Amino acid sequence: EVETFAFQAEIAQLMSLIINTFYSNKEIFLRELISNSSDALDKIRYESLTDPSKLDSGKELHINLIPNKQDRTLTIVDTGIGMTKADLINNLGTIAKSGTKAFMEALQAGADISMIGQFGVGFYSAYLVAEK
Amino acid sequence: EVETFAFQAEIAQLMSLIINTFYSNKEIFLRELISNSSDALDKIRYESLTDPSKLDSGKELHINLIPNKQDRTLTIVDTGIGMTKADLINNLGTIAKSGTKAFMEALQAGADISMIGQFGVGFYSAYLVAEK
Amino acid sequence: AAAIGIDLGTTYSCVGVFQHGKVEIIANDQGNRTTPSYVAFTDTERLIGDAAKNQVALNPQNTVFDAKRLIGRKFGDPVVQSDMKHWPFQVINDGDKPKVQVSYKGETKAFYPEEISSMVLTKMKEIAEAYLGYPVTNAVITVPAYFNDSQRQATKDAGVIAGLNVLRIINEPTAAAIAYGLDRTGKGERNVLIFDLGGGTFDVSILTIDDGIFEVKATAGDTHLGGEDFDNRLVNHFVEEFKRKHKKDISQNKRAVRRLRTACERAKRTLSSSTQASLEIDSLFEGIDFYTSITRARFEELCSDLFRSTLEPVEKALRDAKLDKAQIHDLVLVGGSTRIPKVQKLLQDFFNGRDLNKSINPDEAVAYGAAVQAAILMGDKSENVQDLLLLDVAPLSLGLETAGGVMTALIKRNSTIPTKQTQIFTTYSDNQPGVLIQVYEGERAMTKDNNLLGRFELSGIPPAPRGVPQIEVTFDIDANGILNVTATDKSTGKANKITITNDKPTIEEVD
Numbered sequence: 001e002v003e004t005f006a007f008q009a010e011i012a013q014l015m016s017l018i019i020n021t022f023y024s025n026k027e028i029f030l031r032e033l034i035s036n037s038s039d040a041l042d043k044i045r046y047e048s049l050t051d052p053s054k055l056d057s058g059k060e061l062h063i064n065l066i067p068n069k070q071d072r073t074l075t076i077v078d079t080g081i082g083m084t085k086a087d088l089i090n091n092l093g094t095i096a097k098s099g100t101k102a103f104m105e106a107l108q109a110g111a112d113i114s115m116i117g118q119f120g121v122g123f124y125s126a127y128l129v130a131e132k
Numbered sequence: 133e134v135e136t137f138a139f140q141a142e143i144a145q146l147m148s149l150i151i152n153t154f155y156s157n158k159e160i161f162l163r164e165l166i167s168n169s170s171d172a173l174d175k176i177r178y179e180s181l182t183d184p185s186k187l188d189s190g191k192e193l194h195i196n197l198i199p200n201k202q203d204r205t206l207t208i209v210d211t212g213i214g215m216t217k218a219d220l221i222n223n224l225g226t227i228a229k230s231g232t233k234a235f236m237e238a239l240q241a242g243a244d245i246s247m248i249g250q251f252g253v254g255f256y257s258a259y260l261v262a263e264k
Numbered sequence: 265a266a267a268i269g270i271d272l273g274t275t276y277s278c279v280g281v282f283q284h285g286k287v288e289i290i291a292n293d294q295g296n297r298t299t300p301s302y303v304a305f306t307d308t309e310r311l312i313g314d315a316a317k318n319q320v321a322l323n324p325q326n327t328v329f330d331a332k333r334l335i336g337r338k339f340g341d342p343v344v345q346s347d348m349k350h351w352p353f354q355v356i357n358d359g360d361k362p363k364v365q366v367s368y369k370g371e372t373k374a375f376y377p378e379e380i381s382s383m384v385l386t387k388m389k390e391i392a393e394a395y396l397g398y399p400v401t402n403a404v405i406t407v408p409a410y411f412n413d414s415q416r417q418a419t420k421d422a423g424v425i426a427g428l429n430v431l432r433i434i435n436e437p438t439a440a441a442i443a444y445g446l447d448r449t450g451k452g453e454r455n456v457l458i459f460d461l462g463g464g465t466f467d468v469s470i471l472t473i474d475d476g477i478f479e480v481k482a483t484a485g486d487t488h489l490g491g492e493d494f495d496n497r498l499v500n501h502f503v504e505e506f507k508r509k510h511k512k513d514i515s516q517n518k519r520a521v522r523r524l525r526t527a528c529e530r531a532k533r534t535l536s537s538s539t540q541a542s543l544e545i546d547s548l549f550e551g552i553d554f555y556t557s558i559t560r561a562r563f564e565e566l567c568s569d570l571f572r573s574t575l576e577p578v579e580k581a582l583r584d585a586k587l588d589k590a591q592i593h594d595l596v597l598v599g600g601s602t603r604i605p606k607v608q609k610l611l612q613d614f615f616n617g618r619d620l621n622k623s624i625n626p627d628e629a630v631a632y633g634a635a636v637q638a639a640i641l642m643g644d645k646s647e648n649v650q651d652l653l654l655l656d657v658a659p660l661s662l663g664l665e666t667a668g669g670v671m672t673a674l675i676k677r678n679s680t681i682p683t684k685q686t687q688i689f690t691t692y693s694d695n696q697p698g699v700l701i702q703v704y705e706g707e708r709a710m711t712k713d714n715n716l717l718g719r720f721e722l723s724g725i726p727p728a729p730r731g732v733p734q735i736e737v738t739f740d741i742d743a744n745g746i747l748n749v750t751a752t753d754k755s756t757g758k759a760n761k762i763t764i765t766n767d768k769p770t771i772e773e774v775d
């Protein structure tokens with residue numbers, strides 16, 4: 001069973017802009033995904049300071065990059081805290097509406113796409129090069 | 133009496149891209165509004181060549197520009213063919229359902245906002261300076 | 265409710281809040297601004313601060329303190345090995361990240377030093393909050409200047425565990441320099457020597473400050489020299505005395521020695537303002553009442569080498585900084601142990617009688633600086649500068665009488681102040697030795713119709729044909745409208761001034 005959800009308008013608009021606006025600095029794709037994995041890795045590391053059991057599922061906190069050209073794919077593995085079903089549905093865990101709205105206003109004011117991570121919505125940049 | 137129809141998804145998408153893009157050459161606003169007015173005037177001129185009665189509702193073919201600083205609006209009036217209820221509701225009478233998508237592909241490839249009139253959807257450029 | 269700064273030491277810590285141009289240093293539950301870096305794990309709760317220090321003798325095996333030596337270090341680090349041999353608690357190689365095992369509520373849990381210091385920071389957080397009447401997360405935590413990056417991150421994390429927003433980790437000597445106002449600007453291009461004589465460590469650091477911008481030139485130190493060994497010399501005085509006087513060997517009773525040591529700490533602090541202090545303990549050892557004393561001179565003899573050795577890292581820091589004594593402009597004290605007259609005398613004599621900056625309690629100066637820095641970091645406004653510029657303006661143009669009896673304005677009406685504006689003038693007539701500048705306020709072209717504010721003479725002008733001498737006249741106005749008009753002859757470097765007080769048709773025809 002697969003549940004289908006709508007994107008909240010601010011991000012539905014953001015993703016459209018990422019795909020259709022002619023941004024040339026496509027390299028922020030990897031930069032943002034690696035950076036976001038780092039944040040997840042710190043979320044565990046901090047919790048493990050008062051509740052060590054968070055590392056019982058795997059002591060190693062790291063980022064892996066694994067390209068597979070034959071499938072036109074790249075896997076980025078974040079061994080950080082991850083997300084529950086609920087967080088995936090709820091904008092992959094972020095405050096999408098406030099961050100994205102402010103970002104779109106920044107873009108209307110002349111901001112570059114490289115600033116997307118400054119609004120906490122950096123992972124939507126995946127669509128700069130991703131089809132899916 | 134206000135009837136709601138809502139917009140074709142692809143044109144709604146273009147309007148969002150226009151609105152949220154940092155485009156400085158906003159003079160295309162009036163260029164496209166005038167071009168579209170002109171097209172309406174030529175269509176009626178052609179109708180009158182085989183059916184002159186179409187000029188009995190007014191004969192003169194012209195464009196009237198009236199700024200209204202007190203309303204914060206701009207009025208552009210053309211005396212051309214007009215639009216039927218159906219055209220007005222069917223994405224403003226153009227094949228927006230085709231033209232905006234083709235334009236968006238052009239934008240993905242690096243096309244400018246100023247090329248919007250080349251896709252027959254030039255009037256959506258109104259939202260560069262208009263809110264409504 | 266402003267951001268705070270916390271001075272996180274090995275033996276003691278202190279918190280302050282910066283507001284209204286000053287840092288308020290905040291007292292704990294008992295009225296002490298500076299409280300111990302101790303957490304006591306008991307089988308009922310963890311005591312923090314004085315509460316933990318007060319029972320070290322009873323529960324030393326479960327009391328953890330001086331977390332900083334272990335923080336950011338690897339278990340196998342020689343420093344870790346050096347300190348674990350001195351602790352009553354167990355240090356554990358849990359993945360080469362030393363943890364301390366103590367019994368808390370009956371369980372021998374291993375507590376990582378960052379959580380030990382977060383426990384301390386949490387207590388300091390609570391102290392400041394109770395005082396300010398507001399929850400506080402915006403903070404600056406200081407560290408020794410020698411801390412490496414694992415240590416700095418570890419400090420930030422202790423703050424995060426405690427619920428703090430660590431705005432920054434700054435160095436202990438930077439904070440002291442800030443506390444003493446050496447960063448207020450106008451004091452640039454100066455060398456500052458900071459003498460950090462604390463509890464368990466001694467450090468020397470030479471800073472260069474350029475109008476608020478800091479650079480550290482050199483550091484030196486003794487990682488084991490501080491108040492604790494002055495206490496140990498005072499302890500040996502009293503311990504050996506006890507044994508000989510009573511024929512009872514008190515040195516083997518860790519609690520009796522610790523009670524004696526606590527008295528040594530009290531007597532030593534008292535002794536620093538006094539000439540004499542005493543030890544008075546009921547039933548100290550084997551039921552024996554131990555009543556005795558320490559004079560200031562005896563204390564200095566017991567510790568005479570501990571005091572002299574503090575200048576050895578001073579000489580080292582000067583060598584590393586490539587500076588002579590004469591190149592140090594500012595002498596700064598940090599650490600409660602510098603309150604001992606001998607320390608002050610040795611540093612002051614070393615630097616030829618020059619006064620030490622003792623204006624802020626040595627144990628508060630670091631917290632003080634951290635609080636000031638925390639307030640600017642939380643949002644960059646600190647009793648300046650934009651409000652002064654937008655609210656206070658020059659109400660009338662400011663200028664000077666020049667030849668012809670006319671006023672030349674340098675500061676224009678409604679210009680924001682503070683500001684400095686200049687123009688170039690020459691002597692009016694040929695071959696004059698100086699000029700007469702009359703300073704005026706007002707909007708009239710003629711000086712006779714303006715407000716004379718004051719007059720001064722600029723001497724030292726080489727005589728030359730009119731228009732040749734190059735005189736820069738400066739109107740320097742502060743935020744409150746006070747005006748300082750100065751002038752100088754650029755060819756000689758000579759200058760003078762006046763202080764002004766505050767008030768506050770054919771084309772339609774044919775031919």
Ligand SMILES: Nc1ncnc2c1ncn2[C@@H]1O[C@H](COP(=O)(O)OP(=O)(O)O)[C@@H](O)[C@H]1O
Nearest residue numbers: 273274275276462463491533536599600601603
């Ligand atoms: N008047 C005094 N005379 C002698 N020693 C003092 C005096 N006041 C405080 N001290 C000592 O100063 C030390 C405080 O050190 P501090 O610099 O706050 O901490 P840290 O060394 O942990 O950074 C304690 O060991 C204390 O006994």
